[PDB]
Design a protein around this ligand. Structure first.
Ligand SMILES: [Mg+2]
Ligand SMILES: [Mg+2]
Ligand SMILES: [Mg+2]
Ligand SMILES: [Mg+2]
Ligand SMILES: [Mg+2]
Ligand SMILES: [Mg+2]
Ligand SMILES: [Mg+2]
Ligand SMILES: [Mg+2]
Ligand SMILES: [Mg+2]
Ligand SMILES: [Mg+2]
Ligand SMILES: [Mg+2]
Ligand SMILES: [Mg+2]
Ligand SMILES: [Mg+2]
Ligand SMILES: [Mg+2]
Ligand SMILES: [Mg+2]
Lengths: 156, 129, 205, 81, 123, 79
RNA sequence: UAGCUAGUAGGUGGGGUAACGGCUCACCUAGGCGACGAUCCCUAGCUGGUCUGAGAGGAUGACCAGCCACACUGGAACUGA
RNA sequence: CCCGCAGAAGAAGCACCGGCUAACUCCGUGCCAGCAGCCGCGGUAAUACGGAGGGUGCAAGCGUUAAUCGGAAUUACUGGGCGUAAAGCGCACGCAGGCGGUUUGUUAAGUCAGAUGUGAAAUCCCCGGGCUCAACCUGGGAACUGCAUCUGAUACUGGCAA
């Protein structure tokens, strides 16, 4: 019912008196295909357990995206750590033109046609967080008109 | 020294919206009054008033919707160090249309959509979104 | 210039039928469609996003018997054309004369229709065309030449076609053996398992 | 002398002449002054296989331009029609 | 930088050089094996890589790797070299095209014959 | 009206001639800034009256010397 | 590579060109150019365009077309519109 | 180009298969032979070397090399930075240069609009036409972001005067 997508499974490790303890991290995204997307990051000593933890966290943390006909509303910039992303609406048929983490985020969020570039670092976690920030700060004509106190036609 | 009062006005509004001040006060100008007219009439501020005949002080009332500020972004484009002039067919879009581009055209200060209506170009004073 | 290999291996790779055989019998008794070909067929393949896009492109290409250079020219033309690139690509692929012959039912499979086209057994608007990639426009009357109307291939092809779905944008006869190409088929009309935005993204890569 | 002649373009075996008013010294497909029409010798029927701009040609002849032989034949045929 | 600073001193490109300068922008060069020998590579690799000191027609004296399983290049052999360095070897920036002029093909290859100048064995 | 220019005299040492610096206002092709650029034209001056630093108005004409193709028309102001 | 320039910059007069012109000569002025890069040094035919690029740009100018330059090397003029 | 002939008849190879990157196992070798674009691989169980089967990509082509742009936001005008990663002159004064508070008036240089002239043809792009289709060749348009005038606006910058 909610579309799942595993992005990166990265093996980290901490050092202890005996030696090294190798654990695993899983990054996932959940989305219904219609503007409701969230991301989850989970650690466990084992990859399936990490994936399940990420799944639960992602399902518990979703945000609303004001999609427009399966594409974005206007050009947006998503900024987090060392990752900047730019996302631009595209006419239908364009498909999703983005990197790895951004592709996962948009495919599960339900965007069907978008152009996107990722400047700065391309670490999957920060890329995901920047993309989600950009989507959650993307406006829509209805609420833009509402906040400005005008009508949708009077805005466009 | 103060080498761009227009940028000063925009920065005052930006900082005021950030700090939740109800009104922001500043020195007045013809151009500042015109920009305030444009912003008010497209609903980015409530009201503005210029009080004083020797040192005219302009006061702009800022508006917040559900708690959040309305002027989410406001940028000075044609700055003194790099003036920007655009023709009626390269007038920019702000927020892909939702935003506005305050443009000084030959007939007064008036947004990009209105300039495209009246077939004018001019100096892109600022972007508002 | 033509994939002259075993056909059912392609269907086994893509996991689905591509109609590369006539359809007299179900392909399950002719190949293990569930199993990918080769020594390591039962292996469970974890595909990447590039894997997904690559296999999608191959599937549609193999269906129409198109090679990569020609299909890239199709994609470039579809992107150039106004509207949706994916549906434009599918429509350009459908416009191929061999595919039109197949749909109209003069060939049991697209390879059979291709050989009919290439052996000058097909006319368009009255003129003989032997170009397997000729683009059929609206209102054209794809026909069969008189010296080739007597081939049992065409008959068996027609009675095999009749038990499938009839392409709406076509009008075919079995007596005169003609067909009016009424309109360009729409992405909605074509089979919905083809997911062409994967091809679009792949060629945008 | 400024001459009105045919500059051959097209491809192999399929000529397509452009009627150009040019100095008689320049190369055939070289520098011209004005393009006044075209002529397709293998013109399929139904298609306008020959077009001349008779007002401009008359302008040049008045200015003193000489007319090539094939162009003269084309003008005769087009004004006959 | 500021726009005035850029006007006074515009952005500078990065010229770049060639990893294979002795080719002189030519895909291959004919050279003469002034020496044929073997050398040991950088650590951690260890083996006896086959190289030749070659005198190209443009006068450059260079060192060229020789791929394949055993060669037949004695000194004065006329070989054709191409670009593409060998990593574990210090400074060896070229290969010798197998099967070209004298650098005959590898004896008994079956895969990637075109990379080693081996004609197709009969079916 | 005839084409013309208006500039500032920088030298009158030449006999029956002046050198006029004409400043133009060109938008930089790359960076979009409006930069000052000044061209120096050797301007013919019959009678020889213009001084260093005056605004003079000039017109192109036939060549007159090696580097003098421009000539006065009127003096806009005295400085 | 920071100063370069002696017909050098300008004026007058004579000569010369199809034509204005230090184009050339005599004389008289001491100027002319240069940090908005003069002079020198190293590569280089230029353009329409071509390749790449989302674009801005970047690289290059094979074929085709416009312009220029050259014709074993260095110079000259003659006939000729 | 059209018709007739006879017969599947005369016509498939190249690279790759550890990750990037689509495609995997046996045997030989044993840090040797060798591979390699980078990370790297090879020391007696090698999906990384060589052979074989199987497979993948492309196809009368397939790879390697050379070269350019891209990716490279890695010279950042669009579009970067400078406390510690490379990067604020040791600090000042200051000419040229860059920028300039506020109101009225005037000018129309910048700026904007419109028009005219040019910005060769071809090439790119759009709508069509013709070679059985395509490559190709064409008709018409658009474009050639430009430049020069002329006529207007003159809000903002510039000049000028208060
Ligand atoms: Mg081919
Ligand atoms: Mg040269
Ligand atoms: Mg770029
Ligand atoms: Mg010679
Ligand atoms: Mg003579
Ligand atoms: Mg793989
Ligand atoms: Mg073994
Ligand atoms: Mg760049
Ligand atoms: Mg940086
Ligand atoms: Mg340090
Ligand atoms: Mg430091
Ligand atoms: Mg300091
Ligand atoms: Mg001011
Ligand atoms: Mg043109
Ligand atoms: Mg003023």
């Amino acid at each position: 019912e909610l579309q799942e997508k595993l992005i990166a499974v990265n093996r980290v490790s901490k050092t202890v008196k005996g030696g090294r303890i190798f654990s695993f991290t899983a990054l996932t995204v959940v989305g219904d295909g219609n503007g409701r997307v969230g991301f989850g990051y989970g650690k466990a000593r084992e990859v399936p357990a990490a994936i399940q933890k990420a799944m639960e966290k992602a399902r518990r943390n979703m945000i609303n995206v004001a999609l427009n006909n399966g594409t974005l509303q206007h050009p947006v910039k998503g900024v987090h750590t060392g990752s900047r992303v730019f996302m631009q609406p595209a006419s239908e048929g364009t498909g999703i033109i983005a990197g790895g983490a951004m592709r996962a985020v948009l495919e599960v969020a339900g965007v069907h046609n978008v152009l996107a570039k990722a400047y700065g670092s391309t670490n999957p976690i920060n890329v995901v967080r920047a993309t989600i920030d950009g989507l959650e700060n993307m406006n829509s004509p209805e609420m833009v008109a509402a906040k400005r106190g005008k009508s949708v036609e009077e805005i466009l | 020294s103060m080498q761009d009062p227009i940028a000063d006005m925009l920065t005052r509004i930006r900082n005021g919206q950030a700090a939740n001040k109800a009104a922001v006060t500043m020195p007045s100008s013809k151009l500042k009054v015109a920009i305030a007219n444009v912003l008010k009439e497209e609903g980015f501020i409530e009201d503005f008033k210029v009080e004083g005949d020797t040192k005219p002080e302009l006061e702009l009332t800022l508006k917040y919707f559900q708690g959040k500020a309305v002027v989410e972004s406001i940028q000075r484009v044609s700055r003194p160090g790099l003036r920007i002039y655009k023709r009626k067919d390269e007038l920019p879009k702000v927020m892909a249309g939702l935003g506005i581009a305050v443009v000084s055209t030959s007939k007064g200060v008036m947004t990009d959509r209105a300039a495209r209506q009246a077939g004018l170009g001019g100096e892109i004073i600022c972007y508002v979104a | 210039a033509r994939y002259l290999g075993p056909k059912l291996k392609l269907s086994r790779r893509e996991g689905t039928d591509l109609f590369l055989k006539s359809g007299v019998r179900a392909i399950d008794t002719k190949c293990k469609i569930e199993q990918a070909p080769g020594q390591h067929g039962a292996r469970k393949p974890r595909l990447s996003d590039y894997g997904v896009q690559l296999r999608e492109k191959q599937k549609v290409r193999r269906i129409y018997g198109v090679l990569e250079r020609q299909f890239r020219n199709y994609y470039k033309e579809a992107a150039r054309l106004k509207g949706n690139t994916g549906e434009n690509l599918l429509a350009l692929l459908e416009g191929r004369l061999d595919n039109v012959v197949y749909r109209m039912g003069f060939g049991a499979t697209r390879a059979e229709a291709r050989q009919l086209v290439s052996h000058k057994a097909i006319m368009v608007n009255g003129r003989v065309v032997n170009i397997a990639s000729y683009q059929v426009s609206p209102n054209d009357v794809v026909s069969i030449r008189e010296k080739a109307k007597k081939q049992s291939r065409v008959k068996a092809a027609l009675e095999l076609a009749e038990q499938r779905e009839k392409p709406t944008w076509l009008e075919v006869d079995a007596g005169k053996m003609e067909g009016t190409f009424k309109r360009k088929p729409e992405r909605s009309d074509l089979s919905a398992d083809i997911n062409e935005h994967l091809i679009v993204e792949l060629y945008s890569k | 002398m400024v001459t009105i002649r045919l500059a051959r373009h097209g491809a192999k075996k399929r000529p397509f002449y452009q009627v150009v008013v040019a100095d008689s010294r320049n190369a055939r497909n070289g520098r011209f002054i004005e393009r006044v029409g075209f002529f397709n010798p293998i013109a399929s029927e139904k298609e306008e296989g020959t077009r001349l701009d008779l007002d401009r040609i008359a302008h040049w002849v008045g200015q003193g331009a000489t007319i090539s032989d094939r162009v003269a034949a084309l003008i005769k045929e087009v004004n006959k029609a | 930088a500021t726009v005035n600073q850029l006007v006074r001193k515009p952005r500078a490109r990065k010229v770049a050089k060639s990893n294979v300068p002795a080719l002189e922008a030519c895909p291959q060069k004919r050279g003469v094996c002034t020496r044929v020998y073997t050398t040991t590579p950088k650590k951690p690799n260890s083996a006896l890589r086959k190289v030749c000191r070659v005198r190209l027609t443009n006068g450059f004296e260079v060192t060229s790797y020789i791929g394949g399983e055993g060669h037949n290049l004695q000194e004065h052999s006329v070989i054709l070299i191409r670009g593409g360095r060998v990593k574990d070897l210090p400074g060896v920036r070229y290969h010798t095209v197998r099967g070209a002029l004298d650098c005959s093909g590898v004896k008994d290859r079956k895969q990637a014959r075109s990379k080693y100048g081996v004609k197709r064995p009969k079916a | 009206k005839i084409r013309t220019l208006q500039g500032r005299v920088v030298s009158d040492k030449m006999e029956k001639s002046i050198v006029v610096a004409i400043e133009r206002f060109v938008k930089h092709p790359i960076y979009g800034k409006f930069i000052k650029r000044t061209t120096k034209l050797h301007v013919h001056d019959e009678n020889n009256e213009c001084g260093i630093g005056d605004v003079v108005e000039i017109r192109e004409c036939r060549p007159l010397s090696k580097t003098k193709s421009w000539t006065l028309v009127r003096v806009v102001e005295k400085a």
